[model samples]
Target: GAGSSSLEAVRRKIRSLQEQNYHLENEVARLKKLVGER
Candidate 1:
């Protein structure tokens, strides 16, 4: 039970970070496009 819970914790962290990175990547692209226009 303890090992399974630990594995789940890591999985959750990875998933959250991946989602955050995806949003950050999109944000960077949007900012770049805006800067390019100006």
Candidate 2:
């Protein structure tokens, strides 16, 4: 019903967040390494 559509939206959001955060996670690691080098 209507709830199922809402649930799909939440699922889509979670997938989107994971994809976005994957890049962010790499950037964070790179920054950490740069700080460590200095």
Candidate 3:
């Protein structure tokens, strides 16, 4: 039981972190491009 729960939690956390990181990176890149244009 413990192993199963821990593994699932780790999986969920990894997915959440990856998605957040991707969004942040894209937003930052877009902002940089917009700033350069101005």
Candidate 4:
């Protein structure tokens, strides 16, 4: 149980970071489109 829960904790933290990176990527795309329009 200890090892299994530890692995899950690490996985959850990594998933959260990956989601945050996805958001940043979306923001960059939006900025790029705005620049092209301008």
lDDT of 4 at 12: 82
| Local lDDT at 38 for model 4 | 39
- Relative to the true structure, how large is the alpha-carbon lDDT of every model? 0.82, 0.82, 0.83, 0.80
Q: What is the TM-score of each candidate against the true structure?
A: 0.63, 0.53, 0.64, 0.52
Q: How high a TM-score does candidate 1 get?
A: 0.63
Worst 10 residues of 4 by lDDT: 1-10
Candidate 1 vs 2: which has more TM-score: 1
For lDDT, candidate 1 versus 4, the one ahead is 1
**Which of the predicted structures, 2 or 4, would earn the higher TM-score when compared with the native?**
2
Candidate 1 residues 1-38, lDDT tens each? 35666677898898988988988888888979878873
Model 3: how far is 33 from its true place, Å?
1.3
Q: State how far residue 27 of model 3 sits from its true place (Å).
A: 0.9
Winner on TM-score (2 vs 3): 3
Candidate 1's C-alpha lDDT? 0.82
Q: Report the lDDT of model 1 for residue 1.
A: 32
- The clash count of every prediction, one per candidate, is 0, 0, 0, 0
Query: Best to worst by TM-score, what's the order?
Result: 3, 1, 2, 4
Tens digits of per-residue lDDT, candidate 3, 1-38, equal 35666777888898988998889889888979878874
Clashes of 3: 0
